[PDB]
Amino acid sequence: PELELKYLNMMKMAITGKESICLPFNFHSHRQHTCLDISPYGNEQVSRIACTSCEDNRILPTASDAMVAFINQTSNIMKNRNFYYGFCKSSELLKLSTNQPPIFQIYYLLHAANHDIVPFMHAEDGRLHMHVIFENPDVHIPCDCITQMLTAAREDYSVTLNIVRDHVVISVLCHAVSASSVKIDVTILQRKIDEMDIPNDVSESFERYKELIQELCQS
Ligand SMILES: [Zn+2]
Numbered sequence: 001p002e003l004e005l006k007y008l009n010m011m012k013m014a015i016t017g018k019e020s021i022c023l024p025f026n027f028h029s030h031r032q033h034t035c036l037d038i039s040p041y042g043n044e045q046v047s048r049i050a051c052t053s054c055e056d057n058r059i060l061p062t063a064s065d066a067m068v069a070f071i072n073q074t075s076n077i078m079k080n081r082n083f084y085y086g087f088c089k090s091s092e093l094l095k096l097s098t099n100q101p102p103i104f105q106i107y108y109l110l111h112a113a114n115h116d117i118v119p120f121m122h123a124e125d126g127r128l129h130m131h132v133i134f135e136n137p138d139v140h141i142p143c144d145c146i147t148q149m150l151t152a153a154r155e156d157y158s159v160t161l162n163i164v165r166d167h168v169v170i171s172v173l174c175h176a177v178s179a180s181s182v183k184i185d186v187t188i189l190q191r192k193i194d195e196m197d198i199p200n201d202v203s204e205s206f207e208r209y210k211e212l213i214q215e216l217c218q219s
Pocket residue numbers: 034035036037046047048051053054140141142143
């Protein structure tokens with residue numbers, strides 16, 4: 001007889017809330033309090049209200065937490081190593097990123113949720129773009145994560161989730177570079193990136209995607 005409230009617990013059962021999405025999916029078409037779970041069953045949009053493929057009680061960093069991380073890039077090089085491998089050792093692309101904090105911010109937010117991601121960097125017309133490649137086909141983007149990505153990008157970027165080569169890619173496209181309100185010491189960052197050893201397997205991974213990277217590198 002320890003159950004009087006054992007039947008009252010489920011104060012809110014949730015099943016109905018899902019919906020199918022059409023690709024290429026532009027993140028401007030968000031649904032306020034919903035997520036994105038991409039599986040082989042199809043592409044859908046389910047709310048935290050309904051979705052229990054969630055961070056039980058685990059918290060996610062805000063766009064602000066990502067900006068502070070951006071400001072402290074130089075201190076956390078080896079933590080953010082995956083991000084920097086995306087520049088393919090290119091130093092021009094690196095100084096471009098120091099002018100565009102949302103590029104790092106969006107990666108920081110995406111990495112926080114999904115750790116198994118491959119970022120790639122490209123530039124046209126003097127603006128930096130980013131393509132995040134998902135290793136697993138069991139893609140899931142939490143609501144909190146998406147909301148923060150929309151805060152990080154806002155008026156300048158076109159974040160788009162699309163599936164090619166039976167894999168998922170989020171394409172961050174910079175349409176304008178309205179000047180940043182902060183500045184990173186670039187020279188310190190650039191010397192520290194040259195100090196980094198590019199591991200064979202990490203460099204071999206790119207050539208496993210080079211049949212696909214150039215296809216995305218048309219913007
Ligand atoms: Zn979710």
